[PDB]
């Protein structure tokens, strides 16, 4: 299972959650930004590691990060 971490520079634009192809991410309420929103990653046992979320984040530097880690059946994307 890969690791996905959210950092407090997040502006809560939700662009990363819209992009995930396996539904790893989620929005949760917060108080540190104008959107009162922050991303979370509750379901990292399904993450294929495509970094489609990182291409979508606009902050500099990134607010979502994907660290590739130990591989499994779901992580490798095997249908057999």
């Amino acid at each position: 299972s890969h690791s996905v971490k959210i950092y407090d520079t997040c502006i809560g634009c939700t662009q990363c959650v819209r992009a995930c192809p396996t539904d790893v991410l989620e929005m949760i309420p917060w108080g540190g930004c104008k959107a009162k929103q922050i991303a979370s990653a509750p379901r990292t046992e399904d993450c294929v590691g495509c970094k489609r979320c990182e291409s979508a984040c606009p902050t500099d530097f990134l607010s979502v990060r994907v660290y590739l880690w130990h591989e499994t059946t779901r992580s490798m994307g095997l249908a057999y």
Partner: protein, 743 residues
């Protein structure tokens, strides 16, 4: 319903304002550059019409006028060829003695010592020997003075200006609408009966009145200046009736149906002309007559405006059975709404046609004095093989584009496409297997042979002396083609080609034009190598097409486009899943297959076909005939073909062939230069550009359009482009230097 002209007036206005605003066609480019990447995108998307807009009418208008531009360019290139034949050539002297003067239609200025490239090509002339075979065409045409070449250069220039004007006109003043383009029945009726029928009829006419009599006079020995002008043959007809008595009755037979009385100049001989080493002109005229009749009839199949004819939709809907469901229902709607489907079918057919042209033109030489001009024959075969391969690969590219951007079962459903999509797994499995099996049983034999020859065990080889693998069917078929004239073709005298056999050999000027080509174990091995390479190329391209929309690995691939780098390093890594990357990979394998084809043909022709014959009649081939015994190992290809024939090009420094020696080395350089783009990635390059940019910033000399490294896809594309250029140019220099040097 009915067919008519449909046009709009003044759709776009002629202006310069859009020239000064780069990237007007795409909204993203129009905005202007921030980084250098912009400049690349501007060129990559320049002719992607159906991506600049959504409207089919606009795409078709652009395509039509772009075609006019291409035709104008081709006419300008023809104009140049004829003008150079007329002005800077030795064509007249070659016309006087064709088997001693080697043709040349390009001279160079004496600027930095480069005038050494103006070599002694015979006839009181010094220049560059050409290999396009234009003198042979101009002789087969009847052209005998440079004034006719001037005239055709001027006519071609006029036609090029005309094409350019029509290209402007049909886009800016009178632009046809979609319903005009989407009428395929009338289009096919015109191209079948009007372009190909009337074309070959008119050409048969020219051969009957100009080429035939002027070539009769030339082969009789008459001085090329004392031959009458062609139009004389038309004004005075007794001139024609002296060479062909049948021209006295003059179209009375063609009506009295006694076509027999034309047997004078419309023959069915077969074989070559033993004076010039080409096909009988009386055969070619009759051929063109027959082809014109066939096409003129075939251009009356489809219904346009008078009931009679065939509806394409009806033909397609009628065909279906118990294995294919409803098949062919729904292909007329597809083949009339996507340009990419049409382009794929057309490219496939044109590439295959070019390869067939290569084979038929070596085996049954059409022009006079072409068969004994070895450099021209090699050049033509090789050129046309390369063109055919490239077009076939483009066919796959545009089938993939159709699958990603146009296929849509919600509004245009076809059954056969759906069923192939539903068993693509079995398809790709079986093709994969057959390529592995074919690769083991052809290259493996070579490896067995090399190892048995190095282990001092030649009786254990796969060869004509130890373990024979004779292609029985090929030998059987060419034996049937030998016995054909008189048994299954009573109307023919000689058989279609001299390669079939019968013991007939044709010579010209002490050179060998043609003779029977022998098939043996080596021919068997080479042909199975060829089957292997073609199967592999097919596997790569068809895998790219069939899985362009989705996979078990990436189930929504169509949403990422047709040309994307990857879908990230996850799932194990997904570099090069797009169909563009499959085209990119198939280009290398096409290069491999065509290269082996042209090596096989080049070595075989010198070894068993080309050479010199003696008055006593003993043929000495250019190479000694070593293809039967040295082609069966890899060491024989490295030693007896590459090392032994590169001598001509590595020894041209100081002669007039030194440009080939320079291009040999330049092409090696460009090939090795591409590996840098192919083996690396853009992260390294952007990080190096960072420090270089720092150095520029230190001196207030840094540019405002921020430099970036190339794209991932651009890296791949630059890599394959330089790889192909380097390799093909190396073989070009090798071939031309070698063949020009010996003869």
């Amino acid at each position: 319903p009915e067919v008519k002209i449909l046009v709009d007036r003044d759709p776009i206005k002629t202006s310069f304002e859009q020239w000064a605003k780069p990237g007007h066609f795409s909204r993203t480019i129009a905005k202007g550059p921030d980084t250098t990447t912009w400049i690349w995108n501007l060129h990559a998307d320049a002719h992607d019409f159906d991506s600049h807009t959504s409207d089919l009418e606009e795409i078709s208008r652009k395509v039509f006028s772009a075609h006019f531009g291409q035709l104008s360019i081709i006419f300008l290139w023809l104009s140049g060829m004829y003008f150079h034949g007329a002005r800077f050539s030795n064509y007249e002297a070659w016309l006087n003695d064709p088997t001693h003067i080697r043709p040349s239609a390009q001279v160079v200025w004496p600027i930095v010592g480069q005038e050494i490239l103006n070599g002694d090509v015979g006839g009181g002339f010094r220049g560059i020997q050409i290999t396009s075979g234009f003198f042979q065409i101009w002789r087969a045409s009847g052209i005998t003075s440079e004034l006719q070449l001037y005239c055709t250069a001027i006519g071609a220039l006029v036609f090029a200006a005309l094409m350019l004007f029509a290209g402007w006109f049909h886009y800016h003043k009178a632009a046809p609408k979609l319903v005009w383009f989407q009428d395929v029945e009338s289009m096919l009726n015109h191209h079948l009966a009007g372009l190909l029928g009337l074309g070959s009829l008119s050409w048969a006419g020219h051969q009957v009145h100009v080429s035939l009599p002027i070539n009769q006079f030339l082969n009789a020995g008459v001085d090329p200046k004392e031959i009458p002008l062609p139009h004389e043959f038309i004004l005075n007809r007794d001139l024609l009736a002296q060479l062909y008595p049948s021209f006295a009755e003059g179209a009375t037979p063609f009506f009295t149906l006694n076509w027999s009385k034309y047997a004078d100049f419309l023959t069915f001989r077969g074989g070559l002309d033993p004076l010039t080493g080409g096909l009988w002109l009386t055969d070619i005229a009759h051929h063109h007559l027959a082809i014109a009749i066939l096409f003129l009839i075939a251009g009356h199949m489809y219904r346009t405006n008078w009931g009679i004819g065939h509806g394409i939709k009806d033909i397609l809907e009628a065909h279906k059975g118990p294995f294919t469901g409803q098949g062919h229902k729904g292909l007329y709607e597809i083949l009339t709404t996507s340009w990419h489907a049409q382009l794929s079918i057309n490219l496939a057919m044109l590439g295959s046609l070019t390869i067939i042209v290569a084979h038929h033109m070596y085996a049954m030489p059409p022009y006079p004095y072409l068969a004994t001009d070895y450099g021209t024959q090699l050049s033509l075969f090789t050129h046309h093989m390369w063109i055919g391969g490239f077009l076939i690969v483009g066919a796959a590219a545009h089938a993939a584009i159709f699958m990603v951007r146009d296929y849509d079962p919600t509004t245009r459903y076809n059954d056969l496409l759906d069923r192939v999509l539903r068993h693509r797994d079995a398809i790709i499995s079986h093709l994969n297997w057959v390529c592995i099996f074919l690769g083991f049983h052809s290259f493996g034999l070579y490896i067995h042979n090399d190892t048995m020859s190095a282990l001092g065990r030649p009786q254990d080889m796969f060869s004509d002396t130890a373990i024979q693998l004779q292609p029985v069917f090929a030998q059987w078929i060419q034996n049937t083609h030998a016995l054909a004239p008189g048994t299954t073709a009573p109307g023919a005298t000689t058989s279609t080609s001299l390669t079939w056999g019968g013991g007939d050999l044709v010579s010209v000027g002490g050179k060998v034009a043609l003779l029977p080509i022998p098939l043996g174990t080596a021919d068997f091995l080479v042909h199975h190598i060829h089957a292997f390479t073609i199967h592999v190329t097919v596997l790569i391209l068809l895998k790219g097409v069939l899985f362009a929309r989705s996979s078990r690995l990436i189930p929504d691939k169509a949403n990422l486009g047709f040309r994307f780098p990857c879908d990230g390093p996850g799932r194990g890594g997904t570099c090069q899943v797009s169909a563009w990357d499959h085209v990119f990979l198939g280009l290398f394998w096409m290069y491999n297959a065509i290269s082996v084809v042209i090596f096989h043909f080049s070595w075989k022709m010198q070894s068993d076909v080309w050479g010199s014959i003696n008055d006593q009649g003993v043929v000495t081939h250019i190479t000694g005939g070593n293809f039967a015994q040295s082609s069966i190992t890899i060491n024989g290809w490295l030693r007896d073909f590459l090392w032994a024939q590169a001598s001509q090009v590595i020894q041209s420094y100081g002669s007039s062939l030194s440009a080939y020696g320079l291009f040999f080395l330049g092409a090696h350089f460009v090939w090795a230069f591409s590996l840098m783009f192919l083996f690396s990635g853009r992260g390294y390059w952007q990080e190096l550009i960072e420090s270089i940019v720092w150095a520029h910033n230190k001196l207030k000399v840094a540019p405002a359009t921020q430099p970036r490294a190339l794209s991932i896809v651009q890296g791949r594309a630059v890599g394959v482009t330089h790889y192909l250029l380097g390799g093909i140019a190396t073989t070009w220099a090798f071939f031309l230097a070698r063949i020009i040097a010996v003869g």
